[PDB]
Amino acid sequence: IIGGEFTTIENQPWFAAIYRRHRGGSVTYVCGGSLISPCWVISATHCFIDYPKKEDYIVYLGRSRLNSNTQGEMKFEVENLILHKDYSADTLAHHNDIALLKIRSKEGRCAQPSRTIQTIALPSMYNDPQFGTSCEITGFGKEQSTDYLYPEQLKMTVVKLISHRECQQPHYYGSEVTTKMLCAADPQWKTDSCQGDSGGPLVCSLQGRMTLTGIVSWGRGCALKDKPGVYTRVSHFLPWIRSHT
């Protein structure tokens, strides 16, 4: 997250931290995700496409820090890793960039709701906030484009939804953005998601309910003028989600 503010898991208790094991045993951070039911985390396909073996991954819930344990956290293996069959990427855009992880602990259990672990509601179909609406993004991704390290403490910020018509202008992203994507950015371009935030939640208030409106997917650079963050539009994937869960 470029700009924004530090936070803790209590302010985004559906946030899932996804790591990968390496041959040799070191574990490194991959991507964010969102807990949509006790046994199911939703994320981005591009996070896993190069190493699609479910045994490679570890999922934490209730975690506020990247490389230290948070009190109350739960650790899970990935029972099933479901990537979107119509995924595709070009130099920039990632199409159908959505993935489901069925989580299960060593004891055979799913998430137990607590003060630090809660689910997030899905939107109703084709129901998104109007353009200019402020929404939240959360993650452990870079604080600057040029950073080598990821922040050790969870961050969040606010971005505003951009209309498809505006995001499709040539000076923004042209035809690389589809109707199954949502664009969001800061009016001054000073805050944004970045590398390592992929798979994490874009949350908006809809009908007086906190709702998973987007999944961090792609962008050209981070917090760069005329280059919004691009998010998988969750309200266009409800049949895919319901069928695979």
Binding site: Q195, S217, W218
Partner: peptide, 14 residues
């Protein structure tokens, strides 16, 4: 570059 962007996390080339 591309490898420092959203889209190429956990990629073999990067």
């Amino acid at each position: 570059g591309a490898c420092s962007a959203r889209g190429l996390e956990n990629h073999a080339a990067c």
